[PDB]
Amino acid sequence: HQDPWKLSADKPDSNNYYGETVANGMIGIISSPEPLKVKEVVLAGTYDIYKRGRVSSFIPNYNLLNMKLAFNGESVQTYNINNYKQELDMRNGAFTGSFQFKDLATVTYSYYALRHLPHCIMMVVNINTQKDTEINVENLLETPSSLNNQQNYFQNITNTHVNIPLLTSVAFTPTGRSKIAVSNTFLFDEGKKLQPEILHRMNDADMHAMSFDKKIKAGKTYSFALIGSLISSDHINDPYNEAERLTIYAALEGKSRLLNRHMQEWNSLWQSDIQVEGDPQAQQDIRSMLYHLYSFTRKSTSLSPSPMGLSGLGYNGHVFWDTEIWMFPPMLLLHPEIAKSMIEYRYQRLDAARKKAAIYGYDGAMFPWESADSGAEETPVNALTGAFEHHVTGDVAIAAWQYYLVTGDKEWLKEKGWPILKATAEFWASRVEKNDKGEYEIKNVVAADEWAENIDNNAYTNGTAIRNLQYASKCATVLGVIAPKEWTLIADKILISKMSNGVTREHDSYTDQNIKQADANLLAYPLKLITDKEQIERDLKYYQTKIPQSDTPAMTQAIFSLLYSRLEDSDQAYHWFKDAYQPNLNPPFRVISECKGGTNPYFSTGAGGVLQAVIMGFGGLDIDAAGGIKQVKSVLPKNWKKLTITGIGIEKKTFVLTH
Amino acid sequence: HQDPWKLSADKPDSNNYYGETVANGMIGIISSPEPLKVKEVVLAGTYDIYKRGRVSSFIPNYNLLNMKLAFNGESVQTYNINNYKQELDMRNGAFTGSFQFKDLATVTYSYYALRHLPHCIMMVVNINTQKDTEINVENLLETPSSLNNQQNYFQNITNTHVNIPLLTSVAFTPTGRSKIAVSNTFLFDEGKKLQPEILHRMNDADMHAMSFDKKIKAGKTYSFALIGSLISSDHINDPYNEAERLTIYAALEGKSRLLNRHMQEWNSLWQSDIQVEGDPQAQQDIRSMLYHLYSFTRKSTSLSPSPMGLSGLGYNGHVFWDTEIWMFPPMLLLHPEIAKSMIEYRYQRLDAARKKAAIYGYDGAMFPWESADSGAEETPVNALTGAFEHHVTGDVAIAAWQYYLVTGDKEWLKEKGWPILKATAEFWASRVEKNDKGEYEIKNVVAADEWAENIDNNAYTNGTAIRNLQYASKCATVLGVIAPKEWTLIADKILISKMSNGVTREHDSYTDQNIKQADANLLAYPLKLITDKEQIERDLKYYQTKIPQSDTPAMTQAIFSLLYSRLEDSDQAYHWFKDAYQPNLNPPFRVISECKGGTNPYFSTGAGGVLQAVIMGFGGLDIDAAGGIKQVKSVLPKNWKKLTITGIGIEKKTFVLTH
Numbered sequence A, B: 001h002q003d004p005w006k007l008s009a010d011k012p013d014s015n016n017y018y019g020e021t022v023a024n025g026m027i028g029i030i031s032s033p034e035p036l037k038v039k040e041v042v043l044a045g046t047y048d049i050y051k052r053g054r055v056s057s058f059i060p061n062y063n064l065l066n067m068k069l070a071f072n073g074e075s076v077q078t079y080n081i082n083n084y085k086q087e088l089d090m091r092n093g094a095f096t097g098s099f100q101f102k103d104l105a106t107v108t109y110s111y112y113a114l115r116h117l118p119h120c121i122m123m124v125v126n127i128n129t130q131k132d133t134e135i136n137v138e139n140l141l142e143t144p145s146s147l148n149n150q151q152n153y154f155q156n157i158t159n160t161h162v163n164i165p166l167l168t169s170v171a172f173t174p175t176g177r178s179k180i181a182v183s184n185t186f187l188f189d190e191g192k193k194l195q196p197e198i199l200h201r202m203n204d205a206d207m208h209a210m211s212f213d214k215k216i217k218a219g220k221t222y223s224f225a226l227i228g229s230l231i232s233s234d235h236i237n238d239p240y241n242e243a244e245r246l247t248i249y250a251a252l253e254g255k256s257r258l259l260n261r262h263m264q265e266w267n268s269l270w271q272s273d274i275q276v277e278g279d280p281q282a283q284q285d286i287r288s289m290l291y292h293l294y295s296f297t298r299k300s301t302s303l304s305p306s307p308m309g310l311s312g313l314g315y316n317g318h319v320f321w322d323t324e325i326w327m328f329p330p331m332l333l334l335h336p337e338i339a340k341s342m343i344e345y346r347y348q349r350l351d352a353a354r355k356k357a358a359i360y361g362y363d364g365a366m367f368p369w370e371s372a373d374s375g376a377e378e379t380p381v382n383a384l385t386g387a388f389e390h391h392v393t394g395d396v397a398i399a400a401w402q403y404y405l406v407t408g409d410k411e412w413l414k415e416k417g418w419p420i421l422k423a424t425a426e427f428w429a430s431r432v433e434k435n436d437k438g439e440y441e442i443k444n445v446v447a448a449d450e451w452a453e454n455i456d457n458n459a460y461t462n463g464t465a466i467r468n469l470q471y472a473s474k475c476a477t478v479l480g481v482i483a484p485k486e487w488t489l490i491a492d493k494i495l496i497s498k499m500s501n502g503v504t505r506e507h508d509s510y511t512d513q514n515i516k517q518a519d520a521n522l523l524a525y526p527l528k529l530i531t532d533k534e535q536i537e538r539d540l541k542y543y544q545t546k547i548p549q550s551d552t553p554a555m556t557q558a559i560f561s562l563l564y565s566r567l568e569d570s571d572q573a574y575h576w577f578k579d580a581y582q583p584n585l586n587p588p589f590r591v592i593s594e595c596k597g598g599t600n601p602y603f604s605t606g607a608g609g610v611l612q613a614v615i616m617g618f619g620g621l622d623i624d625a626a627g628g629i630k631q632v633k634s635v636l637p638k639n640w641k642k643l644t645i646t647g648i649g650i651e652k653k654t655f656v657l658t659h
C-alpha cells in the first residue's frame, strides 16, 4: 500500500473508514466504504445558513453518482461481495472500486471530477462475467435534507442518432439563497437502437431514479458510464437549463474524449512534482499533499480553498489566512496560476473589506477572519477571532506582494496588488496607536496563538503589520507613486518585545503559557523579520515545547521543521516534519486531520505547511525579497537519498538535493 | 441657558418639547422629554415604501436605549422625581439627563452615537444612593409598527473571563426590502462573578426585555452601561450576526476605550470652529448649527444628508440640492473630507442619473430632484418638482467643480469630477432649445421658486446650466481633454432677461408674483453671474418682500444676509441673519424648523444657509474661481466685537474679523 502514485485499501471497514476525495476545484466527491456509493458531494462557491456557527456554510449536495446494482434481482452489497478493494490514483484523481460478485462477475468502477469541466462528474462501470447474468442498474437522485422545495424531472433528448435520457433535480438551499440543479445521463457503447430502455420512477418525496436491465453472456465485458452536471445560481443565472445543456454536451463528447482532456489537465498539474528517493512512505505522503492541494484549487478562477478544501463542510467552507500563509506559498512556487486564483479571491472582495473596516472604526481594507461569498465577516459570533484576530489583513498583503515577487507581473501589481497593498496599509496606519515613547502599538487582539485573547502587541500580528506597511511602500516605488511617509515611520517603530531571557515575547501578558500554535516563531519564517540564527534558535528552544499534544492544529511543526532545516539540523528538521502530520492521520488512505488523533480530515492547511517544510525547508527554496526564487542552505533527512523538486518559479526550474 | 458649548433644558415640558439629536452620520437618536427614554432612532441608508409620498423613506427604527428603572419595586415617573434636567454637550454629542429620585438617590445618564463606530450606540448610567437600596433595571426592545416579521432572541456569550448577555431583535421593513438587526448588552465594572444575573422576558408579540437587580449600599455610586448595535441589509449582507458581532466587540473594547475614540473624533471635528465675541446667543446658535451639520454627515463615506439629517423622517430621508448648494459649501471650507462624501454620493449614483436622462429624452446625466438608495428619482408623483425641477443637475456640477477648486485634487478631478461634469454638461447641451435669434432657452420647468410651475427660462435654472457648461469646459482644459465647443457656445447665449425696471426676471411669465424662496437673487450668490453691485441691490430691493412670512422655507434670508454683508450693509445683513432662523425655532433647545413658526425640526438645510451667511458673508470668505479660498469685503453685526473662523481650506487658515 506504498505505491508512489496510488493510495489503496483492501476490504473497507465502515467502522474505521475516512473517505478520500476527488475534486477539480469546483466539485468534491468523498468516498463511501460501500460499493457504487459516495459519502458526500460539495460544490464550491455555494453558501447558505446551515448548521454549524449560525453563519454561511457549504451545503451537502446531491450524491449524484449513487447507484444500485443487482445481479438476477439480487442486490449487490458489502455483505455478498468478496475481494473488495478501493484505490485512489493520484495521477488523475480516479477513485476506483473493484470486487467479485459470487460466481457471476467482476465489477470495477472509477469516478472522476472532470478536470476541464468544473461542473461535470463521470463514473465508468465495467462488468466482466464468469457466467450468464442479467444486471439491473439504478441511478438515484436523492435530495439531501440540506435542500428544500425539490423537483424531480426526467426526459428523453433525441434526434436521429441519439436518445439521451436526462434525470434532473432542482432544489434550494435552506434560506432559498441558492438554486441547485443536477442532471445525469447514462452513456452506452452499443448505440441508440440497441441501448437498454431507461425507466424512471418517482416513488418518494425526496428521491427519483432511472434504471435499466441488461443481459450479459458469460465471458463478456459490458461497460456503461454515468455523467452528471451539478451547478447553482451562484455559478450561472439558469442552473436548471444549464445543467441539462452540460450533461447533453458531455454525453455527446463521450467517455474517451472526456477522459483524454481530463488526463491532459492532470498531466500538466504533475509537471510540478516532488520526488524522494530512499523513503517510499514520504514519497507517497508528499504526493498525497500535492494531490489534495491540486484537487482543491483551480487556475483561472477567483476561488480559494477552505481549511478542508472540498473534502467536506469543515469550517463551513470559509476562507482563512490558511490560504495566504499555508496553502498559497507552495502553490505560488509550483503553479503560480493557482496562487493567482487565491489572491484573486481577495481582490474581488476588497470592497467588502473596505466595508468591514468602516464598521469597526478603521480606514482602508480590513479583511475578515473568515470569508465566504460576499467577502464580509463570516466567523461565528461566539468566536472572538471574528472581531479581534486582525493579522489576516496583513496576511493578504503579504501574499499579494509575494505574487508579484515570484511572477514579476507589473500589470497585475498596478491593477490588483497595489489596490490591496494600499488599502491594507491604510488599515494598519489607522489601527496602530502611538505611545508616549513614540512607539506604535496594536492593542486588544486575538493572537495567532488563538488561546491568547484580547491581549496587546502580539508578535505575529505586529510583524504582519510591519510587513504590510513595508510591502505597500515598496509597491508604490515600483509603480512610481508616492507612498505616505507615515507607513515607513510606523513600520519602523511597531513594538516587538523580548523577555529578559532574550526570547521574543508573544504578547504583552505572555510569560510561559502554553500556546495553541506557532506565533513568535512565525517572525523567523515566513516573515523573516528575525534572521539572526541565535535568535531563531532561542525562540525555538523556548516555544517548541509550549504547544500541547492535544487540540492543537497542524500549523506549527512544519514551521519548526523548516527553521531547523535552515539551521542545518537534519535530525530536528526530520523529527518535526514527521510530527507535523503523521500523528494526525486517519485510515485507510492516510488523510490528515486538523489535530493529533483528530477525526475531521482533510486538513489541506496542514498539507500546505508540510509542503513548505519540504520545498522551502529541505529544498532550501525561498522567495527572494528583490524578486524571483533563490536557494539557501538546507539539509535532508538522513534516510532521504535524493530530493527532486520540479516546475519551480516562472522559469520552471528543477532543483536536485543530495547528501 | 446660553453656555457656548451646551444646550440645556430644566424640567422638560412634554406639552411643548422638541427633542434634540445625537448622531454619527449613520444613526441619529432624538431625545424624549421622559427620563431614560428616546423618542425616535433613524438609520441612514435604509429606505423602503412607508407612509408619506408612496416612495422610499427612512423607517422609524428600534428605540434601542429604552430603559426602565425602579427603586425597591417603585418605577421612576414624572411624579416621584425632582430636579430633572437635560443637557446636550455639543463638544462630544453627549445627551445627558439627571434627576433625583425622592430623597433617596441621584441618577445621571448620558448617551452617544459613537463617532468612530457608525452602527454602535452607548448609554452610561450612574446611580448615587443616600441609603441602602435595590434597583431594578430593564432594557426593552420594542419592534416599532414600521417593521414586521420580527424575531426576539437572547443568549449568553461566555468565556472564562466574561458573560456578555445579548438582547437581539431582527425585523423587516414594510415591503421586505431591508432586514434590520439590533443587539444590546449591559457592561458592568465588577466582573463576571459579581455582575448581576440577567433575566429575559418575551411577554408581547412586539417587545422583549432584559433585566437585572442590584443592591447598592448607602453613599456609593453604581455605574453600568448599555451598548447597542443597529445595522441593516443595506449596510451588510448578514445584519443579524454582524449586530451581535459588533456588540460583542464593543463590550470587549469597554466604555473607557469607546469614549476615548469617540472624543478623539469629535475633537478633530471641532478643530474647525466659529467663535463670536459680544453675542452669547449667536455664539451658541452658530455652534448648534455646526454641531448639527457635523452630526448629520460623515467623512470617508458616500453618505449625503437629507434636509432634516438624522433628526427624523423629514422629506423621507431623501437627498436634494439642499446638500450641494446649502449644506455642502460650509462643510467644504471647514472639513473638505465631509464635502468629499457628499459629492461621492452623487458620483456613485451617476449611472442612475444617466438612466433618468434616457427615460426623459435627454443625453448625459440628469440627477433626480429627490435621491435615496439607488440614485433614481424618488420625488412623490403628486409633486411636479420630480419631473420638472431640473436645476438639481447643475447644482451637482457646481458642487463637483467647487470640490476641485478648494482641494486642488487633480486625481479626484480625473476619476470623479470630470465624469460628473462631462455627463451633466451633455445633459444641458441636450436640454436647451435654440430659438430664431440664436439664443438658447430652457422651457417648461419648475423654478427654484417652486411656486412657479411649468414656466420658461427660470433665472436660477438657466444660471445653473450656464455654470455647469462653463465648469465642464474648464475641467476639460485642466485635464487636457477636448471639450465640445458647443458647451461654451450654449453657455454664452442661455437667456437671462431683465424686466423694464432693470431687475432680473424670475421666469418668462413673471411680473410681481409672491415667490417661495430666493431664485433670481441666487444669481448673485452662490452663482456669481451677477457681480455688479447696483444690479445685486436692485434685485434685492425688488424680490426681498416677495417671500411671504408663512409656509416659506429657510432658503432665502441667509442669502439676503450674505449679499448685504458683501454690500457692506451691517444693519440689513444682521436683520436678515436673525430673520433666517430665529422665527423658525422650537423649544427647549432652539432647534430649527423648515418655515417660520413651523414644527418640523431639525432643518439642517437652513443651518447650512445661515452658516454661509456667517462664513461667506460676515467672514467674507469665498471660493476663488481660479482655485482656493479668498476673502472679500464684509461687515459684522454692530454688537459683534470679534468673529474668528478656524480650519478654513486645505491650509487650515484662521480668519479674524473685528470692526
Ligand SMILES: O[C@H]1[C@H](O)[C@@H](O)CN2CC[C@H](O)[C@H]12
Residues within 6 Å of the ligand: A307, A315, A320, A321, A322, A448, A450, A516, A517, A553, A555, A605
Ligand atoms: O486559521 C486557523 C487558526 O490559525 C487555528 O487556530 C485553527 N483554525 C481552525 C480553522 C482554521 O484552520 C483556523
Ligand SMILES: O[C@H]1[C@H](O)[C@@H](O)CN2CC[C@H](O)[C@H]12
Residues within 6 Å of the ligand: A315, A369, A370, A379, A380, A383, A385, A386, A450
Ligand atoms: O474563527 C475560527 C478559529 O480560527 C478556529 O480556530 C476555530 N473556531 C471555532 C469557531 C470559528 O470558526 C473559529
Ligand SMILES: O[C@H]1[C@H](O)[C@@H](O)CN2CC[C@H](O)[C@H]12
Residues within 6 Å of the ligand: B307, B315, B320, B321, B322, B448, B450, B516, B517, B553, B555, B605
Ligand atoms: O429643496 C427644497 C426646496 O428648494 C424648497 O422649496 C423646500 N423643499 C422641502 C424639502 C427640501 O428642503 C426642498
Ligand SMILES: O[C@H]1[C@H](O)[C@@H](O)CN2CC[C@H](O)[C@H]12
Residues within 6 Å of the ligand: B315, B369, B370, B379, B380, B383, B385, B386, B450
Ligand atoms: O419635491 C419636494 C419639494 O422640493 C418640496 O418643497 C416639498 N414637496 C412636497 C412633496 C415632495 O417631497 C416635494
